[PDB]
């Protein structure tokens, strides 16, 4: 059962999300990212269970990463579903900020507005190792 769940928006954060996976594994954390760990069966159940099972929830805020969450009030967007599950289970949420612009809370669905109240880490392209060490301090 993975220590860390990495949630990300494919069209804009795939590369950073995989970069985060490599570094965290090199530092001894078990990591769930879909392309390495989402295997057979109905994926809706497996994904939700993977979030529920992970102590740490690493949220890759690339540019526009929460845009498809906006007005998703049936909760059909997958980042939205993953965040609400992490919030509902009281996980240690660690937002990683990479060119993300902070939205107004009211533009996000009520069941995920609390994600903006967690302290985020700025991804520094020039000081990546320092960025990684800070992330590890945030993790449990």
Ligand X SMILES: C[C@@H](c1cc[n+]([C@@H]2O[C@H](COP(=O)(O)OP(=O)(O)OC[C@H]3O[C@@H](n4cnc5c(N)ncnc54)[C@H](O)[C@@H]3O)[C@@H](O)[C@H]2O)cc1)N(C)C(=O)N[C@@H]1COCC1(F)F
> Which residues are the active-site residues?
82
Which positions from 91 through 130 interact with a copy of itself, judged by CB under 8 A? 125-126, 128
Q: Is 123 in the site for ligand X (CB under 6 A)?
A: no
Are 104 and 136 in contact, with CB atoms under 8 Å apart?
Answer: no
Q: Is 22 in the site for a copy of itself (CB under 8 A)?
A: yes
Q: Which of 140, 139, 138, 81 shows the shortest CA–CA distance to 115?
A: 81
Q: Is 16 in the site for a copy of itself (CB under 8 A)?
A: yes
The CA radius of gyration of the chain, in Å to the nearest whole number, is 14
Name which of 35 and 136 has its Cβ closer to a copy of itself.
35
CA distances from 80 to 7, 21, 32, 112 (A): 10, 21, 17, 7
State the residues that interact with a copy of itself by CB under 8 A: 10, 14-16, 18-19, 22-23, 26, 35, 125-126, 128
């Amino acid at each position: 059962t993975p220590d860390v769940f990495i949630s990300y928006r494919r069209n804009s954060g795939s590369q950073l999300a995989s970069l985060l996976k490599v570094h965290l594994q090199l530092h001894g954390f078990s990591v769930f990212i879909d392309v390495e760990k989402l295997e057979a069966g109905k994926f809706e159940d497996k994904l939700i269970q993977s979030v529920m099972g992970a102590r740490n929830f690493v949220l890759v805020l690339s540019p526009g990463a929460l845009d498809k969450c906006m007005q998703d009030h049936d909760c059909k967007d997958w980042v939205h579903k993953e965040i609400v599950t992490a919030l509902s289970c009281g996980k240690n949420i660690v937002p990683i900020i990479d060119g993300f612009e902070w939205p107004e809370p009211q533009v996000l669905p009520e069941d995920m507005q609390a994600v903006l109240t967690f302290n985020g880490i700025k991804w520094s392209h020039e000081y990546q190792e320092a960025t990684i060490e800070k992330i590890i301090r945030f993790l449990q």
